[PDB]
């Protein structure tokens, strides 16, 4: 599967505090799609679609914060 945190759990961004999302999941993705916004220190960032794929399920999608350690989303992208 693919992930939402990489191996951090601990530096800089080690969470993840979602305003907005666009999906109902994103059920069939593209190798496009969105920039889930996501809100740090300051700033704000845009996570567009990297692979395609589906859209499998989303645990704490938005409103909530997550960490690393933990997922959020997760991708299935079956030969990358």
Same mark, same amino acid.
């Given at each position: ?7 951090? /759990? *601990?530096? *800089? /961004?080690?969470? +993840? ?7 109902? !999941? ?6 496009? @799609? ?6 740090? @220190?300051?700033?704000?960032?845009? /996570?567009?679609?990297?692979?395609? *794929? ?6 704490? !999608?938005? +409103?909530?914060?997550?960490?690393? *350690?933990?997922?959020? /989303? ?7």
């Amino acid at each position: 599967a693919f992930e939402f945190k990489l191996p951090d /759990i *601990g530096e *800089g /961004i080690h969470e +993840g505090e979602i305003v907005k999302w666009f999906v109902k !999941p994103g059920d069939e993705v593209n190798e496009d @799609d969105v920039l889930c916004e996501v809100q740090n @220190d300051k700033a704000v960032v845009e /996570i567009p679609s990297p692979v395609k *794929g589906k859209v499998l399920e989303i645990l704490v !999608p938005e +409103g909530t914060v997550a960490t690393v *350690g933990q997922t959020l /989303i997760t991708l299935d992208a079956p030969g990358y």
